[PDB]
Design a protein that fits this description.
Number of helices of chain B: 41
Largest interface: B-C, 4 and 6 residues
GO cellular component, one term (chain B): cytosol
Largest sheet of chain B: 4 strands, mixed
Strand content of chain A: 5-15%
Region (Calmodulin-binding) (chain B): 690-717, 842-873
Pathway (chain B): Glycan biosynthesis; glycogen metabolism
Organism (chain B): Homo sapiens (Human)
Distance between the termini of chain B: 86 Å
Shape of chain B: globular
Oligomer: part of a larger assembly
Number of strands of chain B: 20
Number of strands of chain A: 3
Subunit structure (chain B): Hexadecamer of 4 heterotetramers, each composed of alpha, beta, gamma, and delta subunits. Alpha (PHKA1 or PHKA2) and beta (PHKB) are regulatory subunits, gamma (PHKG1 or PHKG2) is the catalytic subunit, and delta is calmodulin.
Structural class of chain B: alpha/beta
């Protein structure tokens, strides 16, 4: 009635995808943007992925002016394997091993399963998505 | 199912119907839901806001409402704020209307919704409507009493006060009506409406003594009201209650004024009679019609003529539209009165006519119309055919007001709330609680009147006090009540004028108007000092009838009766009486003793009174507080001395002692030289005032009347008399007998009437102004206290009545020369007027009785209906005095009881010069009506010449007189006038013989 | 004496929800005791507020109210 088109389309940063979301009594998680291959070829290099991941980890650990611990999902795609496709690259396995033992880049990293992280994580309730 | 499902369903209905089209910019709904219309009314938005408030009040009963109530309260508050902003945007119009009300200065009621600005010129809509303002004030005070907050600062209080001041005078100015059409003819005329008066009275009751700030408030949130305006509104409503208007026998608009929105008819029997009449005369299959002969948006209506042509209303009958919205009002009345059967019957009636949306939501169409192929068939059989739904009954168009009323009615029926919640002010009370309410009924009960009024006695001088005490009379000098102060009426008027002044907008406050007896009956406190005042009857008046003690006895008795009848405040009223030493004047000292002894006895003509010391009465009594102030034969003839030089006239004035010659010389000097001339005793005006006061002191009535005519002074009570005469149904004409006369049909401002009467006075005579004033005040007083005396007379003419009592006094004088009426005392004038006004008896000559009856323009009861039935059964018509009354236009324009047909008949009959001839013609017409009604076989073959019938009757009487008394043929019919109409050989026999002779041929 | 239809908003006798209804919602106020405990609770997502952050408001034990009530109703003449 008032001729309003809502929020215009814009890119989403790491600060928005880190938190959990609730859409119609369901749990949703969104992967970070820098692992997108249908936009540019910047995500086709493993060392590039590693350094952007380290920078994003440092930036997220820096401010985090929200409540609750953050959550990052880093799935392994088919492009992360070697030429033979039978093992992950050396950089990837090094990155995961560095993620373990709680020290990677410039921040403390704790790994586990989504079941335990559910009880302690920021949750956002979306109400505008409910049917009219 | 719990309440949650029902409340959620109502929420969906409201969101999809009512709040969907709200304008965010202003918060006021429009009239059209499609096409992007930019026009809005005031009634629909207010009704929608009231419905939303009621729904929110219903939803309040849940502690987990999830904010549903908050949205509805905020929407209602936004709508009220938007309407208040729109009203306060126009400020010059309010100030103009406060002084000279007119359609030009009227407040605009229609404006654009997008920016809250005017859109259409006042020459095409009128914009004169006061019902909306009253209803808005009532709803605002109801919402504030509920617990909401709408008023921000103190300027809104001043605006509300000015709105109350402007609306206080709605009982005189005609309105355009609820339907905006007004008259049934729809020609462009304004008339009085009873519903507007009732709504204004209800708002005046509601707004009295209420805190506008809500929970907290000390002295800057109260509103002051005047009892005189409320009393006048009540009198007007009671007088005009049986018939909504003179041109409308009944209307459906009388419903929301005697129902839930107003609840103003506290009479039971008359309310029931009106309800039965409306139900019988306006019931329809598909709803309630607006009124009879209503061509409102019918099939024959065309959008090319705003004003209906004459005789079109006759063609427009039988196709009146149906409005089912009144079923909801009737159901609301039924549930309010606790009559479930009526609620069930109206619900069953409303069930089939209701429509549904795509989702099945209820729809209430605006009006019902008939297709063009059943225009004539429906006329033969009323209601046998079926109508068709309007455009706003299928999709894309709705009726917000109707839907709001429907949801309110359904909520009331479903018992989701209680009548107390929707009425926090207790507008409606049942019969067993009408015992100790304020402003409506007394503590003695409805059918009881035994009020006791306190009377305080105050002396004027010590010598008068001791003179009274020597005779046993106890009075107290004003010097012995030092703590108490006595002030005149002007001080209170000035204090009221000082109130209601604002500098930001520009406010003139309460207009300078005299205060009635009820207002002065209270006790005030100004600057910490108690203030008491006496009625305006006691103050010195330049007029002459104030020197007659009989007039004072009568007027104090009338004031006591007025106080007894129309007092409803808590606490006994206070009455102050003062006695002056000049009043007794020697021989005139006995009847004063009589009245004062009767007062001391305790009973004054069936009215109980109490007398005691003023200080005792003051103590232990509630005192009104006004806290705003701190915050803020002659030897000289006209012809002989007209041509005399100025110096000779001055010398004659200086050396003459007679009052009449002095007055005539002063008048000649004023006419020739002017009021600014200087004489031996100062200015001309000062000398005239001095001689007028000296004449009043000497009480020689002719000189006092001449001086009063010179001073050009007029009484300040003519307007109430003319307005009550107009509201009664009679007419008054101002003028001189045998000269030009001015007819008044609508209320007019005092300035225009004063100018007209003074121009007429300058034209014809000298003292007729004061005589006319005394006659009109006496006639108004008599009709107020004895309304049945003036029965049978419609047009009241002062000059003809003057000629009447002059003739009667001349007849009484006989051989003695007739006494001049200019020298008659006020008591003698009143006695003469009451004597002539008497229904008259035998003994005196019948010619004189006929002359008096014709002069008074008396008409027999049932004359108008008899004339109408004659005209119905007269194919050709009736011709009298050269005037023609064609049957077709009067039959196709007017109806049985319409007043304009009677006005036309009176205009036709007013061409008769001899009043006795008019009376004889009226008697002949009555005889013809009775004879024709008693036998339907005989009918007239052509138009009747009543002059021919009168001539034939006169010739027959002449022949009979010649046969019996051997009297030759004598000219003139005064012998016929002398003969009584009934007896051995009366006029009725000759009229019947003429009637049978006309019928046989 | 009150009729059955009127007993809806009477003080100390009946509730607003009605006689045959009990759905009262009770407010609770959560206040921490120490900053260390507050931050420990916040680390797990539990939100508590230290007593030092309610400076306009005051929290007192039950003995102060008893003493204040004991102060009331003292007359020296009798």
């Amino acid at each position: 009635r008032m001729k309003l088109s809502g929020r215009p389309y814009r890119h989403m940063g790491v600060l928005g995808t880190s938190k959990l979301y609730d859409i119609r009594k369901t749990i949703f998680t969104f992967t970070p943007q820098f692992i997108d291959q249908q936009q540019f070829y910047l995500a086709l290099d493993n060392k590039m992925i590693v350094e952007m991941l380290r920078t994003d980890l440092s930036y997220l650990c820096s401010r985090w002016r929200m409540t609750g611990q953050p959550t990052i999902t880093f799935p392994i795609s088919h492009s992360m394997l070697d030429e033979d496709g039978t093992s992950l690259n050396s950089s990837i396995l090094a990155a995961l091993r560095k993620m373990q033992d709680g020290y990677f880049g410039g921040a403390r990293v704790q790994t586990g399963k989504l079941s335990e992280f559910l009880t302690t994580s920021c949750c956002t309730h979306l109400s505008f998505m409910d049917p009219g | 199912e719990t309440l949650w499902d029902k409340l959620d369903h109502y929420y969906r209905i409201v969101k999809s119907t009512l709040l969907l089209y709200q304008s965010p910019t202003t918060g006021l709904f429009p009239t059209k839901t499609c096409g992007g219309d930019q026009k809005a009314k005031i009634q629909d938005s207010l009704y929608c806001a009231a419905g939303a408030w009621a729904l929110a009040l219903a939803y309040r009963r849940i502690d987990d409402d999830k904010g549903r109530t908050h949205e509805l309260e905020h929407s209602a508050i936004k709508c009220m704020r938007g309407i208040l902003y729109c009203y306060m945007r126009q400020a010059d119009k309010v100030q103009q209307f406060k002084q000279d009300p007119r359609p030009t200065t009227c407040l605009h009621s229609v404006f654009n919704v997008h920016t809250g600005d005017e859109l259409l010129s006042y020459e095409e809509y009128g914009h004169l409507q006061i019902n909306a303002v009253s209803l808005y004030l009532l709803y605002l005070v109801e919402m504030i009493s509920s617990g909401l907050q709408i008023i921000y600062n103190t300027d809104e209080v001043s605006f509300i006060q000015n709105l109350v001041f402007c609306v206080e005078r709605v009982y005189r100015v005609p309105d355009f009506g609820v339907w905006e059409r007004g008259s049934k003819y729809n020609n462009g005329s304004t008339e009085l409406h009873s519903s507007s008066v009732g709504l204004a009275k209800a708002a005046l009751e509601a707004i009295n003594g209420f805190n506008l700030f809500g929970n907290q408030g000390c002295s800057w949130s109260v509103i002051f009201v005047d009892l005189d305006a409320h009393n006048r509104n009540r009198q007007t409503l009671c007088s005009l209650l049986p018939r909504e208007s003179r041109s409308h026998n009944t209307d459906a608009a009388l419903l929301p004024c005697i129902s839930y929105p107003a609840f103003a008819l506290d009479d039971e029997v008359l309310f029931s009679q009106t309800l039965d009449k409306v139900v019988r005369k306006l019931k329809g299959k598909y709803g309630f019609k607006r009124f009879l002969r209503d061509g409102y948006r019918t099939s024959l209506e065309d959008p090319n003529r705003c004003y209906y042509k004459p005789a079109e209303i006759k063609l427009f009958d039988g196709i009146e539209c149906e409005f089912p919205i009144f079923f909801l009002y009737m159901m609301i009345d039924g549930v309010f009165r606790g009559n479930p059967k009526q609620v069930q019957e109206y619900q069953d009636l409303l069930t089939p006519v209701l429509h549904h949306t795509t989702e099945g939501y209820p729809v209430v169409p605006k009006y019902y119309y008939v297709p063009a192929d059943f225009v004539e068939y429906e006329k033969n059989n009323p209601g046998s055919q079926k109508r068709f739904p309007s455009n706003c009954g299928r999709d894309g168009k709705l009726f917000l007001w109707g839907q709001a009323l429907y949801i309110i009615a359904k909520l009331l029926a479903d018992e989701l709330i209680s009548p107390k919640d929707i009425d926090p002010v207790q507008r409606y009370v049942p019969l067993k609680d009408q015992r100790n309410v304020s402003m409506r009924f007394s503590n003695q009960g409805p059918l009881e009147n035994d009020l006791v009024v306190h009377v305080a006695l105050i002396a004027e001088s010590q010598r008068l006090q001791v003179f009274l005490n020597t005779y046993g009379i106890q009075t107290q000098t004003p010097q012995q009540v030092e703590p108490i102060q006595i002030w005149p009426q002007q001080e209170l008027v000035k204090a009221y004028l000082q109130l209601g002044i604002n500098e930001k907008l520009g406010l003139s406050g309460r207009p300078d108007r005299p205060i009635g007896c009820l207002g002065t009956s209270k006790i005030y406190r100004i600057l910490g000092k108690t203030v008491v005042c006496y009625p305006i009857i006691f103050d010195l008046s330049d007029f002459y009838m104030s020197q007659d003690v009989f007039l004072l006895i009568d007027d104090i008795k009338n004031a006591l009766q007025f106080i007894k009848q129309y007092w409803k405040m808590h606490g006994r009223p206070l009455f102050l009486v003062l006695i002056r030493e000049d009043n007794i004047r020697g021989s005139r000292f006995n009847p004063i003793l009589d009245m004062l002894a009767a007062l001391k006895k305790g009973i004054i003509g069936g009215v109980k009174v109490h007398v005691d010391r003023l200080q005792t009465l003051i103590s232990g009594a509630v005192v009104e507080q006004l806290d705003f102030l701190r915050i803020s034969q002659p030897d000289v003839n006209i012809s002989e001395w007209k041509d005399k030089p100025t110096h000779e006239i001055l010398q004659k004035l200086n050396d003459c002692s007679c009052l009449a010659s002095q007055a005539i010389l002063l008048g000649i000097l004023l006419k020739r030289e002017g009021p600014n001339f200087i004489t031996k005793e100062g200015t001309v005006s000062d000398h005239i005032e001095r001689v007028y006061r000296r004449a009043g002191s000497q009480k020689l009535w002719l000189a006092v009347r001449y001086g009063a005519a010179f001073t050009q002074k007029f009484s300040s009570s003519i307007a109430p008399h003319i307005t009550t005469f107009l509201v009664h149904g009679k007419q008054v004409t101002l003028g001189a007998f045998g000269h030009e006369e001015e007819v008044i049909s609508n209320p007019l401002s005092p300035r225009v009437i004063q100018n007209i009467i003074y121009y007429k006075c300058n034209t014809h005579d000298e003292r007729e102004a004061v005589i006319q004033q005394e006659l009109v005040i006496h006639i108004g007083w008599i009709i107020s206290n004895n309304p049945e005396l003036f029965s049978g007379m419609l047009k009241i003419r002062i000059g003809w009545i003057i000629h009447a009592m002059e003739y009667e006094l001349q007849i009484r004088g006989g051989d003695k020369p007739a006494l001049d009426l200019y020298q008659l005392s006020p008591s003698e004038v009143k006695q003469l007027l009451l004597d002539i006004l008497q229904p008259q008896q035998n003994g005196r000559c019948w010619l004189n009785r006929r002359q008096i009856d014709g002069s008074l323009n008396r008409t027999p009861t049932g004359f108008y209906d008899r004339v109408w039935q004659i005209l119905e059964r007269t194919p050709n018509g009736i011709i009298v005095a050269g005037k023609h009354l064609p049957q077709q236009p009067t039959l196709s324009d007017m109806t049985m009881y319409e007043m304009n047909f009677s006005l036309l008949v009176e205009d036709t009959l007013g061409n008769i010069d001899q009043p006795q001839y008019r009376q004889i013609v009226v008697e002949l017409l009555m005889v013809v009506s009775i004879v024709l009604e008693r036998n339907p076989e005989l009918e007239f073959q052509d138009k009747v010449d009543l002059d021919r019938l009168v001539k034939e009757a006169f010739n027959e009487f002449q022949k009979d007189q010649s046969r019996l008394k051997e009297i030759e043929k004598q000219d003139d019919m005064t012998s016929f006038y002398n003969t009584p109409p009934l007896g051995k050989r009366g006029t009725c026999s000759y009229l019947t013989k003429a009637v049978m002779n006309l019928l046989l041929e």
